[PDB]
Homo-oligomer: A and B are copies of this chain.
Amino acid sequence: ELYDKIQEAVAYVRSKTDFVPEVGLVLGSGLGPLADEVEKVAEIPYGEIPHFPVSTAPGHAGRLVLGRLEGKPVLVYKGRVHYYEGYSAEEVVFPVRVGFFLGARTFLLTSAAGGLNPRFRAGGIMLHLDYINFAGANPLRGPNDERLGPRFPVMFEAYDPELIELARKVARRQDLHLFEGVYAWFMGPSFASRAELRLLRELGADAIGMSTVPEVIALRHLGARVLGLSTITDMAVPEREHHATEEEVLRVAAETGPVFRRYVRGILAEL
């Protein structure tokens, strides 16, 4: 019963704290240490929350954190879940749906992603301007509940245009080159073949990852404002020799952490 399921998840959260978040922060693979810099009021493992799917993927701690970061009330997702784990597109989006109903109307979706655009560099940061779904799944498939949003949500300006100008302004202020581009959702969990990376780039994709797009679609359905940022942990260009390993991706996510944390806190401060 999607809705009675959300309000159950909501009621269990309010049984631990009455803290109202304004800003949802989803932290991707290796990006979790930013939950530590929060001024904490409550911390809830996903496994205790009704109908929440649990993190199985490396670099995802599976913890909901509530409190103050850079003076904004925030719901931090230390970890997410992914379609490649065996979760449906619907099950993947249950956490940010709960966050929206807890009071979060602005969401920052962060990820570790591969760079398709050869002008990018590993350790770089990319602003999501738009997405492509190459995963063959959609979280809104099935009956629509009008209390969430419409049957056919408009996905133009999926990434909030005011939030991109803010991203840029902060990047400039911090003397940070900010990459911008299109994020492709690839189901995984096998990495892309050379011909798949070639195909996604030629179709207009600048970064490649296994997350984010279902949360974007689900949040726009609800009327939330969305900001997408990936740590470019590796160059996935088929005409170079090496594809990064899981170990290497999580290492560059950790190495890029300080600049990434300082950037996100700088966006939060101005929101």
Contact = CB atoms under 8 A, between A and B. Distances in A.
A15 interface: no
Give 3 nearest A-B pairs by CB, closest first. Answer: A136-B136, A86-B142, A118-B239
Interface in A178-229: 180, 182, 187-196, 198-199, 202-205, 217, 220-221
Q: How many copies does the complex hold?
A: 6
22 contacts: A83-B141, A118-B239, A130-B193, A132-B196, A133-B196, A136-B187, A138-B187, A141-B187, A141-B188, A152-B189, A152-B191, A154-B244, A155-B192, A155-B196, A155-B243, A156-B241, A156-B242, A168-B177, A172-B175, A173-B175, A198-B204, A237-B239
Nearest to A136: B136
A202 B205 contact: no
A192 to B, nearest CB: 6
Contacts of A136: 135-137, 187
Interface stretch (A36-44, A62-70, A102-110, A143-151): A143-151
Q: A interface, by DSSP: helix, strand, loop or mixed? A: loop
B191 A143 contact: no
A32 to B, nearest CB: 16
A194 B246 contact: no
A58 B144 CA distance: 11
Nearest to A135: B136
A243 B154 contact: yes
A243 to B, nearest CB: 4
Contacts of A173: 172, 175
A129 interface: yes
A84 interface: yes
A97 B119 CA distance: 30
Contacts of A246: 150-152
A172 B171 contact: yes
